[PDB]
Each structure stands twice: as structure tokens, then as C-alpha cells.
Amino acid sequence: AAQTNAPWGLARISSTSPGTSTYYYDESAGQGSCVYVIDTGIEASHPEFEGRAQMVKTYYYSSRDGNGHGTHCAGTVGSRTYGVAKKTQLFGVKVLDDNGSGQYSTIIAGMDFVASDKNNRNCPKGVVASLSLGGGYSSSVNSAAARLQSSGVMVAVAAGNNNADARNYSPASEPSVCTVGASDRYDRRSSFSNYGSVLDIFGPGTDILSTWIGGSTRSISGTSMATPHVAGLAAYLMTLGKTTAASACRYIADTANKGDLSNIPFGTVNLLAYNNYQA
């Protein structure tokens, strides 16, 4: 399948070159998979989600996304126009308040929620969790992410936006999850992206168009935007039967575009997420 005039990041993840504008992907499109977006919520009524998004948990007075961040991330996972996996099921877990903040204890509860809640859902092709969030190093946050992964969920987490080594941030620094850095449309490391040995992969993160609250769209930047590209890619590849939740990060690294990013510090992987879709 071909989506013309796609956002650059979608085109990038189906290309061996920068500078194209068509996203190519297998029609299965993540059908039968599930992606949990653990964030500020999801505006499930947005037409872009086509009834495939729902809120499943909140720790606050509403499950509404009063911020936009979670809606944007969910759109990159699975919206019809802006998403990688255009037929996946999206589940929102609101661990972040409408200012975009959340206590680590709430974030931990939300991860253990997903590990159990997947047993309440129909996800025959597998389960992914996208965590476009983080703070300073915490062994308990890392352990929660490790449990979620161990439970059979492909966990993708943002590396962080400090232009620093991700070893000092959580859940970025948890080794067993998929830690995602950000690149731009010219195949440069995004200016803000964290780096370091713990990164597994890069995805598009600078100037990413996606859904926003109030039925709208906007372009924003962050490792928060790179993460859902990888989460959606995992869901897509799991639906194709190419990999599994336990193995998807490694598979994505195996199959990535290699050596094509600039300003990658010595000791950080030079790997850009790629679907290897051949029609």
C-alpha cells in the first residue's frame, strides 16, 4: 500500500533514503495487534482514530486528554493519516495530568496496569506499550518497565530530550526495553535527542505532524514523537508474524537502516527504524 504526501517520518520508516514523501506498508497495517499509549490520554473521538482508540484507565478526574501530547503520540502509532500501524487497536492509559506531568508512583501503577489489562483485551497478533515520558534515574521505574516487557509486551520508551547520555534517565535507562532516540528529516540526530549505549534505535522525532486535541493536527518535536514510530512499527511487524513482543526491538535493530545518521556520538548505535516493506 502507498500513502501519498505522507508525513516525512512515515515516508522515512519505509525508505532506504531520506527525502521522499510516500509511505509504503503492507495492508495488514497492524490489524489484530494492540498498542497501549501510556501518556496524557487519547482524544478517542478524533476522526483520525476511526473508532479504534479508547481510554482504558486514568488516575485523574478525567480520562480526557486535556494536553494533546498523548493524542499526538497515539496518532503517530495508529491514526489513519499520521500513523504507522493504521489498523491497530489503541488503548489509552492516562498516567500524566493535563500539564504533562506525573508522579513516578502513578507511572509505575500504569505500567503494571497494562501488564494485567492486556489479559482483558483481544490482541492475537501481540501487544505493544509506548512510553513517551521519563524523568531522572529510578530503579523502581526501570523495574516496572522491565516487568511490563517480561510480561509479553513490546515496550518502547523515549530516550529523553536532554542532549545527554540516557543512562541518567528512566525508563530510558532500563536495558530490557526498546529505548528510542530521535532523528530529523535530513538524517541528523535531533538536536535535543539523548544518546548513549542504552539506545536501541532512532526514529523520526523532529517536526512530526500528528493528531491533536479538539479534532486538530499539529507538528511537534521530541523523542516522544520518535517512540510511537517504533511502537507502531513493532505492532505492524508483529501482525506480519515477522517478530514477537520479546524479540521485536532486536528485530527492528537487525533490520534498521545502518550508518545513515549524522552527529551520532561514538558508542551510540547508528540505526534508523525501517519496515523493509517490499511490494
Ligand SMILES: O=[Se](=O)([O-])[O-]
Ligand atoms: O514534511 Se512534513 O511531514 O509536511 O513536515
Ligand SMILES: [Ca+2]
Ligand atoms: Ca534495550
